[PDB]
Amino acid sequence: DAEFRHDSGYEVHHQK
Amino acid sequence: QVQLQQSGPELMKPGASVKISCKATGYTFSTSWIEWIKQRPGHGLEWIGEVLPGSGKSNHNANFKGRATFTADTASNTAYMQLSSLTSEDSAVYYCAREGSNNNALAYWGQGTLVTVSAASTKGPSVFPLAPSGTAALGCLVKDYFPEPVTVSWNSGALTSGVHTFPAVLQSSGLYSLSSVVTVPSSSLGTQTYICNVNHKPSNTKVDKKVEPKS
Amino acid sequence: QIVLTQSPAIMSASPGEKVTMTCSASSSVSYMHWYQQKSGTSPKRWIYDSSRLASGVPSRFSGGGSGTSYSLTISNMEAEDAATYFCQNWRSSPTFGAGTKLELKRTVAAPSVFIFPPSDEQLKSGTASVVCLLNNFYPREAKVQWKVDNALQSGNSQESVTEQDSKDSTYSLSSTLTLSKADYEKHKVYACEVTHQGLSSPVTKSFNRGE
After folding, report:
1. Which amino acids does the record list as binding Zn(2+) 2 (chain A)?
2. What ranges in chain C are assigned the alpha helix state H?
């Protein structure tokens, strides 16, 4: 349902 | 504080187009997405789409097949959802919502807009007794009305204990039916009067029905 | 790509009891949002970014987890906490979980069953409605089987259930069997058969047409 929703930039910066 | 206020309920014919508004206050209208959420009973919450006011940008749920359009008017701080070619499936509560300040959870919600898609016309209910069967049960059947709602009380609001007024059911005819019941001591069936007060405003139906054991 | 599963669908908790509801993801997610919804009102943001309580949310609420499993916890269950709780994550499809309905727990109570014949007034209109009431029962799950001269009815009944009662924590159910007057007059025995946890065997309330 929310596939094409906007990006806000709250992505976790993955280390591994 | 951020606030979202939606337009009132909409009663629609099948095949029509509905436009719901969402007035936003307490923040810069052009810097946040106004998002839309559908809720049917037995389906949970479904994301429909969104608009970024003043940008000309919108995003869609693909399963809506271009029937949903999302616009905004920056001058009045109001976002709009238009849903065309309405069916019974489109009967739902529709919410507008917005992200939090420093988080992407939907922190701010509109109060919801109920859309009812129906081919039915205004009809007054017939009120039928549910005649008494230690503890006895009696009631009234409020059958074949459109639209919702009906107001039901017992003995002009004096009798409230042991009263169950049930959610209305939508029949295949497109008309509603509800029941209201009360459980009482069976020894009082000869002395105490029991009257259901029924008010259906759109049809101008106002009925007081006394319910007693059958002769 | 990522599916959210809320287990269980219905959660029952006594007043004072510790409550934990789980939102399981089919693959790792970095956060979980939680929303509270009561009947007739919009969902409210309850716990966001896995563990952060929204303004006005009481301290008895908490959240946690990582990877494929997240949870919402109430330290002591209160009556006002009875609601549906939806977990939510934007990387999931669908984005909202199906919801955990949280109700108050009480002892098993069998329904008091009542059958109502159609009124003579209704029979003038050409339709007959037969009503069965299931009064003050717990748990919510109940089965109503309409029987017309021992024949099991299907597709010709509708039912609804009241919200959990604030005083005794019970539910009530009303079922209507609808048939034409012509069909009604061609049969004798009308029966409402009730299956419920508090009934060792199903209970049947019946009437004979005319009697």
Report:
1. 6, 10, 13-14
2. 120-123, 181-185
Question: Which of C51, C45, C80 is CA-nearest to residue C63?
Answer: C51
User: Which chains neighbour B (Cβ–Cβ under 8 Å, 3 or more pairs)?
Assistant: A, C
Partners of residue C5 on adjacent β-strands:
C24
Amino acid type, B72: A
Report CB contact under 8 Å: B183, C112.
yes
| Closest C-chain CA to A7 | C90
Q: Is C107-211 a CATH 2.60.40.10 domain?
A: yes
Touching subunits for chain C (3+ Cβ pairs under 8 A): A, B
DSSP category for residue C126: T
B61 at the A interface (CB within 8 A)?
A: yes
Distances from the Cα of C139 to the Cα of B142, C14, C18, C195, angstroms: 27, 13, 20, 12
- CB B176 within 8 Å of CB B169: yes
For residue C71, the surrounding DSSP H or E stretch is: strand C61-74
Question: Which CATH number is correct for B120-215, 3.40.50.720, 2.40.50.140, 2.130.10.10, 2.60.40.10?
Answer: 2.60.40.10
**Cα–Cα distance between B36 and B53 in angstroms, integer?**
14
- Chain C within 8 Å of B3 (Cβ-Cβ)? no
Q: What Å resolution does this PDB entry report? A: 1.9
CA–chain centroid gap for C2, Å, is 27
